[PDB]
Design an enzyme around this catalytic site. Structure first.
Site, short mmCIF file in Angstrom:
data_model
loop_
_atom_site.label_atom_id
_atom_site.label_comp_id
_atom_site.label_asym_id
_atom_site.label_seq_id
_atom_site.Cartn_x
_atom_site.Cartn_y
_atom_site.Cartn_z
N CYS C 9 0.81 -1.18 0.00
CA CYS C 9 0.00 0.00 0.00
C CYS C 9 0.86 1.25 0.00
CB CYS C 9 -0.89 0.04 1.24
SG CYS C 9 -2.08 1.45 0.92
N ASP C 11 0.17 3.87 1.66
CA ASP C 11 0.35 4.19 3.10
C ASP C 11 1.66 3.69 3.67
OD1 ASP C 11 -2.00 5.51 3.38
OD2 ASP C 11 -3.12 3.74 3.92
N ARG C 13 3.09 1.84 5.88
CA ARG C 13 3.26 2.07 7.31
C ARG C 13 4.42 1.24 7.87
NH1 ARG C 13 0.97 5.29 9.42
NH2 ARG C 13 1.20 4.31 11.49
N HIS C 65 -2.76 -3.92 5.11
CA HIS C 65 -2.59 -3.52 6.49
C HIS C 65 -3.79 -2.82 7.07
CE1 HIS C 65 -2.27 0.87 5.97
NE2 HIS C 65 -2.03 0.48 4.73
N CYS C 68 -5.82 1.39 6.97
CA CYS C 68 -5.59 1.81 5.60
C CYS C 68 -6.69 2.75 5.12
CB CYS C 68 -5.56 0.59 4.69
SG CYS C 68 -4.77 0.93 3.08
ZN LIG Z 1 -3.03 1.61 3.06
#
Ligand SMILES: [Zn+2]
Ligand SMILES: [Zn+2]
Ligand SMILES: [Zn+2]
Ligand SMILES: [Zn+2]
Lengths: 183, 182, 183, 182
Positions: C9, C11, C13, C65, C68
């Site tokens: 993703c 994101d 993380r 994850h 999200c």
């Molecule tokens: Zn995400």
């Protein structure tokens, strides 16, 4: 079963079967704004791959035309939204040839860009892994680039025509040379 | 200046101008394999957006057809290359209606999937940001999904029509419920 | 030279190399909103084709994850613009499994959709002509679907794992079955 | 909640969080082969749009890198399949700067194309409808294009930066004129 692929404009001002002197079902047809072959457009490329590899179509035609709105909106500033993104490929072509077009009377530029664009799309088409592959394995295939003049209902072959990668390079480059240097 | 957008299939014999009583000039046309409106297809969504936002077209028609090579290629387990990835969207649709389709005589299955498809492509068309915003801001826009046959012509089960997100649900869901009655 | 493809993703993380216990350059990485493999996304598919066919990567990982924003905006009405179109593939997954998710407490739905989505994307991945082709010609390749929990920094294997098309079907279908029927 | 969008290459060793003094959490990341921003790529443009319109990110960085397999695969005449279609966009760029590149020692050519590329991808990024409208409506947004090297680190020729369509032209054109001085 179809023996041609027609890649045309969504303006579709002509009936492809009239222009090609064909009946329907002989013609496999894709259409989008300003008859583009974009390198990474999955939609057009799928059409081409299925035609070339599965259907064994021997002739692909990119037909452009005059008084096309894609061509006009490409030349215009105006933020029209998502369609600008699609037309940015044509703007890139517009500036690639900005010297030719600058030398041009403002009113003959759209006609000229319509032509340049057809030549450039046949060039993109002939550089796809699909078409190059077809050629390397001896498959018979010819690319053609035409322009329909909506104001007098005539086709014009644009002297862009390839049956290999060498012949693609020869006629593309020669087409741009004429367009660039001739009045 | 055009008034309709026609989304058709690259196979289909019979261009829009022949099937309709409209000239070329009044039709704006997109064609791809199995007449799809895929959520993330820049090609088709650019046609829709230009049609709706710029040309102010007030009717979009997705036209599917019987005896369609895309539909048939979707159903076959054949390794045809790149085109299979395009058609995986039709196979999702097949899997989504697998129970219905599994009930039918195998010879009736391609005709069903063809009709289910138009229904799903109108459902996708009508959930695009472009169409919802058109409706949201009060712009008149009608979506239609028809299936054409070479012999019978247009099937008088028609199907989908939407003039809003709400009419979109009703029309979609009923069309599926209706096609389920065998 | 890289031995893994990470599809993650935007994101991002986690650091993929931490989670995989790898150093960079072992990992070939693609990232988009909600770690999708869309059938006709040229961008992701190019990544996969180049990894599988040219680089001969033996392991592709779809890592999803928790917390999200793609997953959240997918579940939300709100017209956010172009990103809605991309997230409509996830909304389709959201309604595909609407019975499971309905039975769910509203606050556990995002966690669950995150999981379902990972499983569905591994399924899309394993149905691509690229991956299927690799398998048919004896190429060694394994697809994996993981979820990183941002709130306790742990990976979870999602029991989705394929080294062929039969094994794809077996673990996909079993994954959905557990998710659907278990508490 | 993130504050930067990083567009990087799928090859590149060194993820954004290692190259930068930013954690994961503050970086929103897209990666594809040869760190491209193709006008009609739904994947990348969805990241940009979500970043700018929804997350309100105020800096996008396109980071290219030396010794990049995409750049090198673009230059080779190899039939690698689907990936070649993706890289045809880099080959257009090569052809567009062919004169410059033809002047250089062949061993210096990949490094030039890598830098030209970042410059062109920032030029594409900055002409997307999403970014122009952000600027048009007065939203603060800075585009940056950097090239990373494993040994030298970030090349202190930097290059492109845009805070508007006008700064975009100046910065693009100067970066190309500068890279032409040999
Ligand atoms: Zn995400
Ligand atoms: Zn036109
Ligand atoms: Zn068809
Ligand atoms: Zn690279």
């Amino acid at each position: 079963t179809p023996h041609y692929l027609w890649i045309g404009c969504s303006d579709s001002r002509a009936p492809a079967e009239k222009l090609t002197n064909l009946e329907p079902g002989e013609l496999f047809v894709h259409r989008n704004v300003a008859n583009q072959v974009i390198h990474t457009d999955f939609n057009c490329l799928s059409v081409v791959q299925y035609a070339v590899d599965v259907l064994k179509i021997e002739h692909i035609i990119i037909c452009g035309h005059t008084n096309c709105g894609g061509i006009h909106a490409a030349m215009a500033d105006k933020d029209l939204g998502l369609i600008n993104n699609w037309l940015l490929h044509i703007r890139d072509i517009w500036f690639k040839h900005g010297h030719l077009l600058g030398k041009l009377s403002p009113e003959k530029r759209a006609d000229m860009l319509t032509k340049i664009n057809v030549a450039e799309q046949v060039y993109n088409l002939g550089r796809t892994s699909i078409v190059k592959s077809a050629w390397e394995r001896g498959q018979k295939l010819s690319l053609h680039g035409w322009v329909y003049d909506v104001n007098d209902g005539f086709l014009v072959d644009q002297g862009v025509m390839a049956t290999s990668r060498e012949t693609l390079e020869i006629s593309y480059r020669n087409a741009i040379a004429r367009l660039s240097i001739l009045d």
